[PDB]
Amino acid sequence: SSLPVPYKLPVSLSVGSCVIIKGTPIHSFINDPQLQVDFYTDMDEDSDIAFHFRVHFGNHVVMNRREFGIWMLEETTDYVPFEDGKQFELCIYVHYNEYEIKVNGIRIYGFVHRIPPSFVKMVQVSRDISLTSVCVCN
């Protein structure tokens, strides 16, 4: 891994920002690896989460948010166009009303803001990936 995992990256996000995550799953899909990305409101792991994104490779993606310490209503999609054993590029684009999630250039979901994305102060990338690079662009 080029970067340690869990990878906790302090960030400042605004409308127009893009978080770009490149990495590779560390297990084959028959071993049910996962990838997780959390848009935290503070460096503290127990702080509120504006956008939680957990991929079960080869299966589905679960998304949620944590508000006042409470997990809210989970959202899911079965559209997970990651390839077994290959490097992926995950782009999370901050729009005025949602996070647009793209996997290998393919839009898979739009997760609507319930708090402003400018409240996000740390992005944590975790679980079963080797992390090649993480960029925040505008």
Numbering used by the authors: 2 to 139
Sentences reproduced from the published study:
Galectin-13 (Gal-13, a.k.a. placental protein 13 or PP13) was first isolated from human placenta, and its gene has been mapped to chromosome 19q13.1, which is in close proximity to the galectin-4, -7, -10 and 1412 genes. As with all other galectins, Gal-13 adopts the typical “jelly-roll” fold formed by sandwiching two anti-parallel β-sheets that consist of six (S1-S6) and five (F1-F5) β-strands and a short α-helix connecting strands S2 and F5. Gal-13 crystallizes as a dimer with its subunit interface formed by the last five C-terminal residues (Val135, Cys136, Val137, Cys138, and Asn139) that are located within the F1 β-strand. We found that Gal-13 forms a homodimer structure that is stabilized primarily by the presence of two disulfide bonds, unlike the structures of other prototype galectins.
However, we did not find lactose bound in the Gal-13 R53H mutant, even when the crystallization buffer contains 50 mM lactose. Nevertheless, the R53H variant does trap a molecule of glycerol at that site, and that trapped glycerol molecule is not observed when we flash cool a crystal of the R53H mutant in the absence of the glycerol cryoprotectant. Moreover, the C2, C3, O2, and O3 atoms of these two glycerol conformations occupy the same positions, whereas the C1 and O1 atoms are oriented differently. In one instance, the C1-O1 bond is oriented towards the conserved tryptophan (Trp72), and in the other, this bond is oriented towards Arg55. In this regard, the conformations of the two glycerol molecules in the R53H variant are different from those in Gal-3 and Gal-8.
